[PDB]
DNA sequence: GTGGAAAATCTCTAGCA
DNA sequence: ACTGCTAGAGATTTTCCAC
DNA sequence: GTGGAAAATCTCTAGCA
DNA sequence: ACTGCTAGAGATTTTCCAC
């Protein structure tokens, strides 16, 4: 299991933790309360 | 020790001291202090210091709309080469972008357009134009301009050129065309010492040439290779063989490789 | 001619990159082009660079030199 | 080394060009270019033609690359000097226009178009054109129902004509042909640049008489004295600039 | 050749082609092509890719006003250490900043105040306050925030801490004080593994201690050095000697060095 | 190594502290601490005092560092729990407050001030104070004309009292004294941290009985078996954490 | 005790920097402190670093060990 | 003599050439038509 | 193999909304 | 399941010219 | 002298108006 | 005549622990 703390878009406040669905190079696909989002890894922290 | 973790948690709940502070003050291992910090949601306020890399395939074009002197300039850049086509359009509308894209597809082999989510790139007219010309449509992560890092850069470079030739053109469209000309054919540098136009010609010509040569070699150089499964040969040389193993290309020395 | 079409394929130059290095690597020698990957050879090192990170050219300033 | 006599003999018996003699014998292209430039018996890519085709009260400016059949077609508001100058500026920006052919029309001879040609470097001059324009007209007639405006139909026809009409020597589209032709032109320009770069060097071997330099290499220096291309080790020949 | 540079000049006047394009197309040395480019004013549109370094003396403080939740926070940072004093003020006024600086001088040895040119910092009240307390007033180049990098950075960091403790203080002043406390005494790291408060204590104590020691040594270790004028000896050892040569400190091997 | 006997004898005949030995005989501070702690016959910096001074209808909260005479004085709107809690929070943020002495006043025993002490970690408790307050009165009177407000006068007086006033054992100002005292406190904290870090280790020399580790040096391991601080080569003593 | 005072002044740590390097160099040994410059020794290399680029501390964590 | 082309402050348009009066680490003092200015070397180019 | 100018390589920054 | 880059300005390093 | 976890060091990025 | 930095997140490299 992975916890992703992410900054989706133009929102300084961070969110999470969100379930991690896919991890690539520069993009993590995460599920936060059934909402699927793509976050650049500069704006996502995985634990 | 493990009873100092409770005091570390209690101090983290108020002060949110970083792992080093807890390790030093409460005499804890780095691992335990780091774990305590990693258990707090309010201390997770930083991503990883990295930068991905954009797609550099020969058939990907990056489009974006810039604004100069109250006029919309639609700019497209060949990512693999740096060759830009720009045009001043009346208003940032989906139809203008669709016309620009249809023009572009007929002059160069656009196999994919990478764009931001702007109201003029997600329109249905652009979708239909892409469907007609067989263009794959990529959209960057919302509000992630770095994804378009190439074209945005050109918006700077292009603009710079317009600032040197503006006095020679009485209207912005002429200056934009002059800037495209200068960037493509009069500004050299880059990977091959080329200019963008020569670079794009080289990229496309090499793509066709390598495609036909590889088709020839495949039609002739046929083999089945067994190493250490019946995979397919790619390149045998210098005692090292490259083998496509069910879409898993593996390079292995000559030993433990049989080309049958 | 199969031993000279191989030379033709190897006359190209593949400027590539890794997954963490932003600077473009030097002009390797294109050993093979595929739909999804390119096998190149940079200083006696056979690598399989993805297509989305490779610029294949045939630099003419060098070919005509 | 080795295969130079084969090159010269093959040339005299087949008057072949330098690309063939330098790809079949592995010579420095400057040396092959010198080889073909030794006998009198053995001594384009930027040519565009403009035309106006009138459909449905709209003028379409068509620029045809004569060597390739490559069309750039745009419907323009009017046959004014400004619109044709804009089309020419775009054409120069996208592809390397060197000289341009028109029909001596009123739109193709205005001071605005003259200054656009002067700025972009184009040089004005007054059966490919007719066939290609008829082909564009036919394809527009085919694909007109697929779009409302005529500009979209023109662009669809240009796309089909350039990239989906495969007819020629080996089933090649116009885009492929133009890319190849421009690549060859770049190659020629690089060779001429190298020739002009070395042509200031004079080489003495063993002295003997002066010489013309054709290639300096890692350990092989190929030079020429009186229509005699010979290779020499670097420890034998000395160059100077004059 | 030299008559082939007029064509380069003309094509530069028209297109401002960079030096590489001129050199490649017109067969010119890089030197003359770069000279042609360097002779044009329009093509001088870039500085040097460098970053200076701010003053990190033990007695320099960097000040700036930030805004959070519609409230002004005046923030001062000790550049040598990273120790921040911050306070929420009613409005951005010269008198409020003068009071803040007067408080600062009485609690820590401020020997220099570095600030942006904002209306509050350049006022006459702040000037009089600095004169009374003997503070040197330093102003960065206008609209050059990098000059104040340290304090600007602190703002970010400071704001971060507030976002973690803003649910524990009903008002912003209390949260600001909590953030200052956490940064000073609960966030370690930096150069010595210290926290900012420990770092400032160390810096100041070391300044006083080394001043005392150096005064003692100077009172004792009196020498004149005649190498290769009569310089003043500083440190002799390890086969080398350091000598102040009329305000030009020079280090020379033991040879050719006479300590008289 | 070869420096312990002199320090031990010096301490026996002078009962001196551990900094003196660690600076005169050049031993690691842990071993000097052990030497001083091995003898039973040879067995503060963070306490502040708060007070209110009423001048011109304005209450001045004064915090005195009893170890140094360092004053932090500020006029506050009223003797309210919120204002005193704000002052205490500031005092904790700037300097390391560990315990605070008050006068059991109404403003020093409010739930707000209690929770401010609890959050900042301060521990409440109910002749330096009087002398330092009187000094602040005198200096304010001296520099009350230089300002039009009592807050500015108080800050001027605090600056003068802390810095411009040089009096003491060696002619030192309160700022220098407080810096030195806090530096010594940090030193003590580091010593205790390292002692607690190593105390979980047991060393066997040459086996013999276990031992207490005092210094795992680069090339000399100093341990102590039964109040006998002896150095050993690293090739003689083996450790285990327990 | 002039030698001992010399040793005391050499017991400090000077984190310094150069003109172009942004990263803070390592803990050199303070050989001399002056009004405008500090003379330090980093791996047997005597240097004169300006006062506006020098952090002189006495790391207590590294001193009490 | 030195020619300095500088971007002074909040003015994307570059200026000059001006006369260089002093060169330091990260700051150049320049004279543009008797107007003395200080420019970070990130925003000044010397020829 | 030795020095000196010159070309290549490398490092680094502003700006792109 | 996607992704910062470009072009220019100094500085440093090879490299070829002549013995 | 050999591997493995751990600690130190180095590289790199967001945000500060 | 003045000047980008800081703190954190991954990755890489020493380094000590045990023979
Ligand atoms: C309304 C559309 C759709 C939604 O997003 C907005 C905002 N936006 C913002 C930038 C921008 O931030 N440019 C500066 C920049 C900064 C960093 C970098 F790496 C690249 C950069 F371009 C654009 O370029 C841009 O085109 C848009 C845009 O079009 N839109
Ligand atoms: C009206 C005053 C006087 C004239 O200047 C303005 C504008 N300004 C701008 C920033 C600013 O751009 N911050 C972001 C930032 C970006 C980069 C960097 F390195 C440091 C940074 F802080 C400030 O911080 C700031 O304090 C001011 C300010 O106070 N003023
Ligand atoms: Mg956009
Ligand atoms: Mg944009
Ligand atoms: Mg400000
Ligand atoms: Mg600011
Ligand atoms: Zn936390
Ligand atoms: Zn120019």
Tell me if D223 sits within 8 A of D212, measured CB to CB.
Answer: yes
Per the domain annotation, does B55 fall within a domain? no
D24 and D38 co-located in one domain = yes
F180 closest CB neighbour out of E132, E168, E205: E205
Angle C2-9/B196-220 helices, nearest 10 degrees?
150
Ordered domains of chain H (ranges, CATH): 3-46 (2.30.30.10)
Which chains are adjacent to chain A, needing at least 3 Cβ pairs under 8 Å? B
| DSSP-derived secondary structure for D2-68 | -TTHHHHHHHHHH---HHHHHHTTT--HHHHHHHHTT-GGG--TTEEEEEEEEETTEEEEEEEETTT
Chains F and E touch (3+ CB pairs under 8 A): yes
> Which of F25, F185, F186, F190 is best to mutate for the G interface (most G CBs within 10 A)?
F190
Strand partners, D60: D53, D75
Resolution in Å, one decimal, please: 3.2
- End-to-end CA, chain E: 65
Per the domain annotation, does G65 fall within a domain? no
From E123, E142, E145, give the residue whose CB has the most ligand 2 atoms within 8 Å, as the site to mutate: E145
As for how many domains chain C has, the answer is 1
Assign 3-state DSSP to chain C and report helix, strand, coil percentages, each to 5.
25, 35, 40
State which ligand 1 atom lies nearest to the alpha carbon of B149: 19
Alpha helices in chain B (DSSP H): 4-15, 19-26, 30-38, 94-107, 124-132, 149-165, 172-185, 196-220
Q: What is the rounded (10 degree) CA torsion for E118, E119, E123, E125? A: -100
Q: Which CATH number do you get for residue F176?
A: 3.30.420.10
How far apart CA E45 and CA E59 sit, in angstroms, is: 38
Those residues whose C-beta lies under 8 Å from the C-beta of residue F197, and which sit 6 or more positions away, are B27
E111 and E20 co-located in one domain = no
From E152, E153, E156, E157, give the residue whose CB has the most ligand 2 atoms within 8 Å, as the site to mutate: E152
Contact D155 B106 (CB under 8 A): yes
Helix (H) or strand (E) holding B74: strand B71-78
CA dihedral sign of residues D130, D135, D138, D143: negative
CA distances from F138 to E6, E125, F156, F157 (A): 83, 25, 12, 9
CA distances from H35 to B67, H2, H32 (A): 34, 16, 5
- Residue in H with minimal Cα distance to E51: H26
CA dihedral sign of residues E154, E160, E163, E166: negative
E79 and E188 co-located in one domain = yes
**Maximum separation of any 2 CA atoms in chain C, in Å:** 40
Strand partners, D61: D52, D74
How far apart CA B238 and CA F227 sit, in angstroms, is: 71
How far apart CA G35 and CA F75 sit, in angstroms, is: 38
How far apart CA D92 and CA F67 sit, in angstroms, is: 84
How far apart CA B54 and CA C24 sit, in angstroms, is: 13
Strand duo B231-237 + B240-244: pairing: antiparallel
Per the domain annotation, does G63 fall within a domain? no
Q: Look-up: residue for tokens 């008289």? A: E260
Q: Which CATH number do you get for residue F228?
A: 2.30.30.10
Tell me if C57 sits within 8 A of B203, measured CB to CB.
Answer: yes
B65 and B184 co-located in one domain = yes
Angle B4-15/B19-26 helices, nearest 10 degrees?
140
F60 and F38 co-located in one domain = no
Residue D9 CB neighbours (<10 A):
10
Q: Look-up: residue for tokens 């600039």? A: D241
CA distances from F82 to D75, F36, F63 (A): 77, 46, 16
Structure tokens at F151: 């807050």
D125 and D209 co-located in one domain = no
Specify burial of residue D44 (Cβ count, 10 A radius: 0-12, 13-18, 19+).
exposed
How far apart CA F33 and CA F38 sit, in angstroms, is: 9
Tell me if D210 sits within 8 A of D224, measured CB to CB.
Answer: no
As for how many domains chain E has, the answer is 3
Q: Is the CB of E45 under 7 A from strand I?
A: no
Those residues whose C-beta lies under 8 Å from the C-beta of residue E218, and which sit 6 or more positions away, are none
Contact G57 E206 (CB under 8 A): yes
Residue D49 CB neighbours (<10 A):
18
F210 and F133 co-located in one domain = no
Residue B19: alpha-carbon gap to chain centroid: 36
Tell me if D165 sits within 8 A of D142, measured CB to CB.
Answer: no
E248 and E186 co-located in one domain = no
Per the domain annotation, does E243 fall within a domain? yes
The residue ranges of DSSP E strands in E25-183, in sequence order, are 61-68, 71-78, 84-89, 112-115, 136-139
Strand duo H28-32 + H35-39: pairing: antiparallel
Strand duo B136-139 + B224-227: pairing: unpaired
Per the domain annotation, does F195 fall within a domain? no
- End-to-end CA, chain D: 27
Contact H38 E41 (CB under 8 A): no
Residue E8 CB neighbours (<10 A):
23
Q: What's the CA–C1' distance between F154 and K6, in Å? A: 53
Strand partners, H22: H29
D115 and D85 co-located in one domain = yes
Residue D106 CB neighbours (<10 A):
9
Q: What is the rounded (10 degree) CA torsion for E13, E19, E25, E26? A: 70
How far apart CA F45 and CA F96 sit, in angstroms, is: 9
Mark which of B152, B181, B196 sits at the end of a domain: B196
User: 3-class SS at H3?
Assistant: strand
Strand partners, D220: D233
User: 3-class SS at E129?
Assistant: helix
Q: What's the CA–C1' distance between F240 and K2, in Å? A: 21
Per the domain annotation, does G17 fall within a domain? yes
Q: Look-up: residue for tokens 């918006």? A: B155
Structure tokens at B138: 């990529």
Tell me if B77 sits within 8 A of D134, measured CB to CB.
Answer: no
CA distances from D96 to B36, B112, F121, F221 (A): 64, 25, 76, 80
Q: Please identify among residues 146-205 of chain D the ones whose CB lies closer than 8 Å to any CB of chain C.
A: 183, 186-187, 190-191, 193-194
Per the domain annotation, does E241 fall within a domain? yes
Structure tokens at B101: 């894209």
Residue B2 CB neighbours (<10 A):
7
Specify burial of residue G2 (Cβ count, 10 A radius: 0-12, 13-18, 19+).
exposed
Q: What's the CA–C1' distance between D134 and J18, in Å? A: 66
How far apart CA E118 and CA E98 sit, in angstroms, is: 13
Chain D interface includes B128 (CB < 8 A): no
Method of structure determination:
cryo-EM
Q: Please identify among residues 170-229 of chain E the ones whose CB lies closer than 8 Å to any CB of chain F.
A: 173-174, 177-178, 180-181, 184-185, 197-198, 201-202, 204-205, 208
How far apart CA E229 and CA E227 sit, in angstroms, is: 7
Tell me if C57 sits within 8 A of B206, measured CB to CB.
Answer: yes
Per the domain annotation, does E55 fall within a domain? no
Tell me if B57 sits within 8 A of C51, measured CB to CB.
Answer: yes
F171 and F242 co-located in one domain = no
Contact B108 D152 (CB under 8 A): no
Tell me if E65 sits within 8 A of E75, measured CB to CB.
Answer: yes
F57 and F98 co-located in one domain = yes
Residue C11: alpha-carbon gap to chain centroid: 9
The answer, yes or no, to whether the previous bond of A17 is cis (omega within 30 of 0) is yes
D117 and D130 co-located in one domain = yes
Domain residues for B11? 4-38
| DSSP-derived secondary structure for B76-100 | EEETTT--EEEEEESS--HHHHHHH
How far apart CA E178 and CA E173 sit, in angstroms, is: 9
Helix (H) or strand (E) holding E149: helix E149-165
Contact F193 B24 (CB under 8 A): yes
How far apart CA D97 and CA B177 sit, in angstroms, is: 14
| DSSP-derived secondary structure for chain F | ---HHHHHHHHHHH---HHHHHHHS---HHHHHHHHHT-GGG--TTEEEEEEEEETTEEEEEEEETTTTEEEEEEESSS-HHHHHHHHHHHHHHS---EEE----STTS-HHHHHHHHHHT-EEE--HHHHHHHHHHHHHHHTSTT-SSHHHHHHHHHHIIIII---SSSS--HHHHHHHHHHHHHHHHHHHHHHHHHTTEEEEE------EEEEE-SS-EEEESSS-EEEE-TTTEEEEE-
Per the domain annotation, does G64 fall within a domain? no
Question: Cα–Cα–Cα angle for H27, E140, E106, nearest 5°?
Answer: 135
Q: Which CATH number do you get for residue D39?
A: 1.10.10.200
Check residues 125 to 184 of chain E and report those whose beta carbon is under 7 Å from nucleic acid strand L: 138, 140-141, 144-147, 149-150, 152-154, 156-157, 183
Nearest 5°: phi and psi at G59?
Answer: -55, 110
Q: Which CATH number do you get for residue C25?
A: 2.30.30.10
Domain residues for C33? 2-63
Nearest 5°: phi and psi at G5?
Answer: -65, -35
Per the domain annotation, does F99 fall within a domain? yes
How far apart CA E41 and CA E39 sit, in angstroms, is: 7
Q: What's the CA-to-centroid distance between B64 and ligand 4, angstroms?
A: 5
Contact A26 B50 (CB under 8 A): yes
Quick one: residue F227, left, alpha or beta (phi over 0 = left, psi -120 to 50 = alpha)? left
Residue G3 CB neighbours (<10 A):
7
């Amino acid at each position: 299991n992975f916890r992703v703390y992410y900054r989706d878009s133009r929102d300084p406040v961070w969110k999470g933790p969100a379930k991690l669905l896919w991890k690539g190079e520069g993009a993590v696909v995460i599920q936060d309360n059934s909402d699927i989002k793509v976050v650049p890894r500069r704006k996502a922290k995985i634990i | 020790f493990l009873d100092g973790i409770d005091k570390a948690q209690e101090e983290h709940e108020k002060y949110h001291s970083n792992w080093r502070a807890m390790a030093s003050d409460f005499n804890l291992p780095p691992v335990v202090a780091k774990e305590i910090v990693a258990s707090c949601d309010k201390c997770q306020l930083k991503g990883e210091a990295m930068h991905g890399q954009v797609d550099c395939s020969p058939g990907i074009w990056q489009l974006d709309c810039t604004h100069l002197e109250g006029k919309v300039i639609l700019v497209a850049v060949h990512v693999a080469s740096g060759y830009i086509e720009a045009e001043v359009i009346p208003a940032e509308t989906g139809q203008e972008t669709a016309y620009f894209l249809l023009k572009l597809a007929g002059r160069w082999p656009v196999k994919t357009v990478h764009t931001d989510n702007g109201s003029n790139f997600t329109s249905t007219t652009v979708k239909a134009a892409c469907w007609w010309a067989g263009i794959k449509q990529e959209f960057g992560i919302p509000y992630n301009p770095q994804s378009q890092g190439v074209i945005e850069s050109m918006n700077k470079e292009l603009k710079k050129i317009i600032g040197q030739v503006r006095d020679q053109a009485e209207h912005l469209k002429t200056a934009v065309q002059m800037a495209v000309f200068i960037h493509n054919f009069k500004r050299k540098g880059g990977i091959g010492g080329y200019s963008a136009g020569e670079r794009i010609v080289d990229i496309i010509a090499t793509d066709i040439q390598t495609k036909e040569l590889q088709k020839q070699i495949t039609k002739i150089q046929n083999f089945r290779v067994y190493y250490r499964g019946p995979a397919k040969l790619l390149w045998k040389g210098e005692g090292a063989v490259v083998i496509q193993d069910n879409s898993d290309i593996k390079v292995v020395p000559r030993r433990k490789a049989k080309i049958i | 001619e199969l031993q000279k079409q191989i030379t033709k394929i190897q006359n190209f130059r593949v400027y590539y990159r890794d997954s963490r290095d932003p600077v473009w690597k030097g002009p390797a020698k294109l050993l093979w082009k595929g739909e999804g990957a390119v096998v190149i050879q940079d200083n006696s090192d056979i690598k399989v660079v993805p297509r989305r990170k490779a610029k294949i050219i045939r630099d003419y300033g060098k070919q005509m030199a």
